[PDB]
């Protein structure tokens, strides 16, 4: 298991523009296109991202390119972030993947905001962090996914994914 395989399970793969869990236009492997209510606006962002007239449809290869870019960006975002970087550096490889996952899903800012959990992560208080993370909109909206991520932090293993 690795971050790519982990996120592909969590996000799935869609080749046609679709609406995410929040109602936003997305495509491929969790690639958010836009928060705006317009499909056209979505189609424009998509063509701009792909570099061609897609007509709201991409290929597998293209979906994977988006995904590579997004993972890379999440990692880079963590490392450039004052609050995130140190947490990240303090963690083992499996737990780093869980943090990347969260960043990928809710962006650097959102995560950077879980002050208390960040402190617990750093202090390696596994069980308390798991409790704390569940008290969130995030857990309430996408519970199965959150549970997988939480177990990952709690145990430091890939069990929830195997
Ligand atoms: Cl893009
Ligand atoms: Cl879910």
From Swiss-Prot:
Domain of life: Viruses
Summary of the function given for this chain in its UniProt record: Endolysin with lysozyme activity that degrades host peptidoglycans and participates with the holin and spanin proteins in the sequential events which lead to the programmed host cell lysis releasing the mature viral particles. Once the holin has permeabilized the host cell membrane, the endolysin can reach the periplasm and break down the peptidoglycan layer.
pH dependence: Optimum pH is 7.3.
GO cellular component annotations of the record: host cell cytoplasm
Binding site for substrate: 32, 104, 117, 132
Protein location: Host cytoplasm
PANTHER family membership: T4-TYPE LYSOZYME 1-RELATED (PTHR37406:SF1)
Name of the featured protein: Endolysin
Catalytic activity: Hydrolysis of (1->4)-beta-linkages between N-acetylmuramic acid and N-acetyl-D-glucosamine residues in a peptidoglycan and between N-acetyl-D-glucosamine residues in chitodextrins
Organism: Enterobacteria phage T4
HAMAP family: ENDOLYSIN_T4
E.C. number: 3.2.1.17
Pfam families reported for this sequence: Phage_lysozyme
Effect caused by changing residue 117 to V: 50-fold decrease in enzymatic activity
